[PDB]
């Protein structure tokens, strides 16, 4: 009734795209700490019984091909779909190693009318990437997507080179503690509070020092989502 059916034979895929090293010509810096995030996510979603696939350092062309191919798999026996993007970004954009890709292009492959074996099932996109440079089918084709953004629209997102990103480390911690207990929006709300309260940047550069972050949940889900059943 009010909750997604999560007792299909499989929970579904968890695709993790981990972009650390970028082509020199793009002028984008290496994302130290992202391997910590990727490993944390792999273990966290493994324990939720997702079929995890980790991909590292994909070009924009490889990202689009991977998403297209995954969207053409038969997900009939799968409850849900999860994609995690770890990269540089701007508003609406995630970076391949050699240039940007529109988030819309990626998510469009999974529209209710374009991936029929995921129609009516939750499709979760978890995005650790900047969104700018500020500091501090009788159902809709866009239905059943959830975007868990690391940061508010327009804002930078913070990544610690030793500890991993504020958002991903918090997300994994909350999933570990609460996935057997809380509905997903409430888990993400705990993530919001953790990031907002427990982190503040430290920098020798006054422009970047003492800055804060709030993640942003964007839900077009039509049911409650529990990882257990």
């Amino acid at each position: 009734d009010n909750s997604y059916k999560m007792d299909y034979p499989e929970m579904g895929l968890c695709i993790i795209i981990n972009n650390k090293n970028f082509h020199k010509s793009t002028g984008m810096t290496s994302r130290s700490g992202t391997d910590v995030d990727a490993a944390n996510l792999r273990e966290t979603f493994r324990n939720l019984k997702y079929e995890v696939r980790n991909k590292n350092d994909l070009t924009r062309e490889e990202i689009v091909e991977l998403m297209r191919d995954v969207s053409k798999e038969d997900h009939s026996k799968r409850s849900s779909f999860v994609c995690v993007l770890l990269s540089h970004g701007e508003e609406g954009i995630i970076f391949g190693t050699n240039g940007p890709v529109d988030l819309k292009k990626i998510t469009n492959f999974f529209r209710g009318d374009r991936c029929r074996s995921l129609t009516g099932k939750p499709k979760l996109f978890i995005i650790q990437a900047c969104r700018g440079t500020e500091l501090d089918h009788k159902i809709p084709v866009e239905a059943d997507f959830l975007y868990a953004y690391s940061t508010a629209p327009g804002y930078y997102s913070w990544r610690n080179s030793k500890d991993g990103s504020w958002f991903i480390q918090s997300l994994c911690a909350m999933l570990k503690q609460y996935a057997d207990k809380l509905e997903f929006m409430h888990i993400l709300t705990r993530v919001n509070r953790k990031v907002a309260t427990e982190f503040e940047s430290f920098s020798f550069d006054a422009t970047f020092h003492a800055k804060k972050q709030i993640p942003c949940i964007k839900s077009m889900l039509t049911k409650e989502l529990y990882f257990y059943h």
Binding site: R31, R159, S161
Partner: peptide, 4 residues
């Protein structure tokens, strides 16, 4: 701490 670094930005993405």
């Amino acid at each position: 701490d670094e930005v993405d």
